[PDB]
Scaffold this motif. Structure first.
Motif, PDB file in Angstrom:
ATOM      1  N   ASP A   1      -0.260   3.307  -0.288  1.00  0.00           N
ATOM      2  CA  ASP A   1       0.505   4.073  -1.274  1.00  0.00           C
ATOM      3  C   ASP A   1       1.929   3.527  -1.489  1.00  0.00           C
ATOM      4  O   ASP A   1       2.405   3.384  -2.635  1.00  0.00           O
ATOM      5  N   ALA A   2       2.616   3.246  -0.381  1.00  0.00           N
ATOM      6  CA  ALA A   2       4.004   2.813  -0.430  1.00  0.00           C
ATOM      7  C   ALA A   2       4.493   2.427   0.954  1.00  0.00           C
ATOM      8  O   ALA A   2       3.798   2.653   1.946  1.00  0.00           O
ATOM      9  N   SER A   3       5.680   1.829   1.005  1.00  0.00           N
ATOM     10  CA  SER A   3       6.388   1.638   2.257  1.00  0.00           C
ATOM     11  C   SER A   3       7.719   2.363   2.139  1.00  0.00           C
ATOM     12  O   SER A   3       8.265   2.519   1.039  1.00  0.00           O
TER      13      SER A   3
ATOM     14  N   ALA B   1       2.551  13.860   1.159  1.00  0.00           N
ATOM     15  CA  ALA B   1       1.961  13.750  -0.167  1.00  0.00           C
ATOM     16  C   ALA B   1       1.857  12.287  -0.590  1.00  0.00           C
ATOM     17  O   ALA B   1       2.710  11.465  -0.236  1.00  0.00           O
ATOM     18  N   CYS B   2       0.802  11.968  -1.337  1.00  0.00           N
ATOM     19  CA  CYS B   2       0.684  10.676  -1.997  1.00  0.00           C
ATOM     20  C   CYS B   2       1.456  10.763  -3.303  1.00  0.00           C
ATOM     21  O   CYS B   2       1.674  11.857  -3.821  1.00  0.00           O
ATOM     22  N   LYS B   3       1.847   9.617  -3.852  1.00  0.00           N
ATOM     23  CA  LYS B   3       2.609   9.613  -5.099  1.00  0.00           C
ATOM     24  C   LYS B   3       1.851  10.326  -6.219  1.00  0.00           C
ATOM     25  O   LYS B   3       2.460  10.956  -7.089  1.00  0.00           O
TER      26      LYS B   3
ATOM     27  N   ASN C   1       1.144  13.592   8.083  1.00  0.00           N
ATOM     28  CA  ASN C   1       0.559  13.918   6.785  1.00  0.00           C
ATOM     29  C   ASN C   1       1.656  14.174   5.742  1.00  0.00           C
ATOM     30  O   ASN C   1       2.509  15.053   5.931  1.00  0.00           O
TER      31      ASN C   1
ATOM     32  N   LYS D   1       4.265  -2.249 -10.472  1.00  0.00           N
ATOM     33  CA  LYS D   1       2.946  -1.981  -9.902  1.00  0.00           C
ATOM     34  C   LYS D   1       1.886  -1.831 -10.993  1.00  0.00           C
ATOM     35  O   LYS D   1       0.725  -2.198 -10.795  1.00  0.00           O
TER      36      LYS D   1
ATOM     37  N   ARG E   1       9.113  13.421   0.511  1.00  0.00           N
ATOM     38  CA  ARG E   1       7.687  13.650   0.271  1.00  0.00           C
ATOM     39  C   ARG E   1       7.275  15.004   0.809  1.00  0.00           C
ATOM     40  O   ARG E   1       7.696  15.399   1.892  1.00  0.00           O
ATOM     41  N   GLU E   2       6.460  15.714   0.037  1.00  0.00           N
ATOM     42  CA  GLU E   2       5.963  17.017   0.449  1.00  0.00           C
ATOM     43  C   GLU E   2       5.231  16.938   1.776  1.00  0.00           C
ATOM     44  O   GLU E   2       4.490  15.982   2.022  1.00  0.00           O
TER      45      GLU E   2
ATOM     46  N   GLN F   1       2.065   8.863   6.829  1.00  0.00           N
ATOM     47  CA  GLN F   1       3.186   7.953   7.010  1.00  0.00           C
ATOM     48  C   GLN F   1       3.250   7.551   8.478  1.00  0.00           C
ATOM     49  O   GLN F   1       3.220   8.407   9.375  1.00  0.00           O
TER      50      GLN F   1
ATOM     51  N   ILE G   1       2.747   4.010   4.189  1.00  0.00           N
ATOM     52  CA  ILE G   1       2.063   5.223   3.789  1.00  0.00           C
ATOM     53  C   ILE G   1       0.719   4.861   3.201  1.00  0.00           C
ATOM     54  O   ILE G   1       0.648   4.113   2.238  1.00  0.00           O
TER      55      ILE G   1
ATOM     56  N   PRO H   1       5.616  15.691  -5.894  1.00  0.00           N
ATOM     57  CA  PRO H   1       5.119  15.268  -4.570  1.00  0.00           C
ATOM     58  C   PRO H   1       5.992  14.246  -3.827  1.00  0.00           C
ATOM     59  O   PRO H   1       6.128  14.326  -2.598  1.00  0.00           O
ATOM     60  N   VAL H   2       6.542  13.282  -4.565  1.00  0.00           N
ATOM     61  CA  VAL H   2       7.256  12.159  -3.964  1.00  0.00           C
ATOM     62  C   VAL H   2       8.439  11.809  -4.844  1.00  0.00           C
ATOM     63  O   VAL H   2       8.303  11.746  -6.058  1.00  0.00           O
TER      64      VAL H   2
END
Ligand SMILES: [Cl-]
Ligand SMILES: [Cl-]
Lengths: 124, 124
Positions: free
Chosen positions: B121-123, B64-66, B62, A66, A85-86, B74, B107, A42-43
């Motif tokens: 989720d992330a930057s 994907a999340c990790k 839109n 984390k 990212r997907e 995003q 994100i 995914p990422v």
């Protein structure tokens, strides 16, 4: 079985370019680094610096990971990176990725002797 | 019990400053947002934009999340953020954080009606 250090190199190192030069960078790299085998990863972040420079982060700023482990290190300098990212259109076996290029500090988990990167935790 | 949206606001929103103005920002904010109760939260990002601007990310790109979920978004623009991570000297109940200010895309995972941020989720 792939070693942890070797897996980090395959998943996260791309020293052969200074930066992502197009929107298709991720589609191409995720496939060629074998990150879309049975499913689309995914990422995934690629770092556009020398292997030596990324390895050197393991003796830079010690910071929490984390997940709460204490073997993470934050690069003193920003580095060129590309986050992949997907997208919504992504559907295995036709994986599809958004390419986002940035210049950010990286945070890696380090392990072993030699003490080298084994996980990419985040960018800042 | 705190709602997911309210927990996101408490952990990740700081609209009252344009940016971290000193190395002590994280120590102060991690304590005041109650993120050092029984243990030091290892890693936490604060976003220095309006609540409205962060909520608006839930209708932006839109991605994907990790963790593989598909409810992440995003931000189209970079935002001012501060990453807080525990240092080596950090030991509960004397938590200690490194403050790193940056301007990056964020994100977030979104959920609910209204459809609002529930996880950072992330930057990028
Ligand atoms: Cl990654
Ligand atoms: Cl966070």
């Amino acid at each position: 079985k792939e070693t942890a250090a070797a897996k980090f190199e395959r998943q996260h190192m791309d020293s052969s370019t200074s930066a992502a030069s197009s929107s298709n960078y991720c589609n191409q790299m995720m496939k060629s680094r074998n990150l879309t085998k049975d499913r689309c990863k995914p990422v995934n972040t690629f770092v556009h610096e020398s292997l030596a420079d990324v390895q050197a982060v393991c003796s830079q700023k010690n910071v929490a990971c984390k997940n709460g482990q204490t073997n993470c290190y934050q690069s003193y300098s920003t580095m060129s990176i590309t986050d992949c990212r997907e997208t919504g259109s992504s559907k295995y076996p036709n994986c599809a990725y958004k390419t986002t290029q940035a210049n950010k500090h990286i945070i890696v988990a380090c392990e072993g002797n030699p003490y080298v990167p084994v996980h990419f935790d985040a960018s800042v």
